[PDB]
């Protein structure tokens, strides 16, 4: 039921295309939403 | 006439007796669903020894 979000902001210095950074960063939890809703599909918003 | 529409009204005047002087009633209906519990009673604490 619970919906959790993990995130960490990192200042990348590497160029933008196809460069997922070769390193390690542990993502910290932000919130724990006590919803009771099933989730099967998702989409980003821009 | 012969169309008695269902809306009626009250006639509260400030010298009525009990049973006719108006009351304010609210009901707090509780329910337990499959969702996680979000509303709960207070949890008092003690000192730090």
Best mutation target among B35, B37, B39, B40 (most A Cβ atoms within 10 Å) is: B35
Q: Which of residues 1-49 of B touch A (CB under 8 A)?
A: 33-38
> Concatenated DSSP letters for B1-47?
-----S-------TT--TTTS------------SSPP----------
Could you tell me which chain B residue has the CA closest to the CA of A33?
B36
Method of structure determination: cryo-EM
Look at the block and give the residue holding tokens 């997922």: A20
The residues, any chain, with a CB within 8 Å of residue A1's CB and separated by 6 or more, are A34, A35, A36, B34, B35, B36
Residue A6 β-bridge partners:
A29
What letters, b where the CB count within 10 A reaches 16 and e where it falls short, cover B11-32?
eeeeeeeeeeeeeeeeeeeeee
CA neighbor of B29 nearest in space, from B14, B39, B19 = B39
Residues of A in contact with B34 (CB under 8 A): 1, 36
Q: In this structure, are residues A5 and A31 in contact, taking their beta carbons and an 8 Å threshold?
A: yes
């Amino acid at each position: 039921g619970y919906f959790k979000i993990y995130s960490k902001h990192t200042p990348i210095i590497v160029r933008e295309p196809e460069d997922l950074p070769q390193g390690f960063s542990a993502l910290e939890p932000l919130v724990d939403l006590p919803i009771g809703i099933n989730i099967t599909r998702f989409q980003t918003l821009l | 006439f012969n169309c008695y529409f269902p809306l009626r009204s009250y006639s509260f005047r400030p010298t009525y007796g009990v049973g006719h002087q108006p009351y304010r009633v609210v009901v707090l209906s509780f329910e337990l669903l499959h969702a996680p519990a979000t509303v709960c009673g207070p949890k008092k604490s003690t000192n730090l020894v």
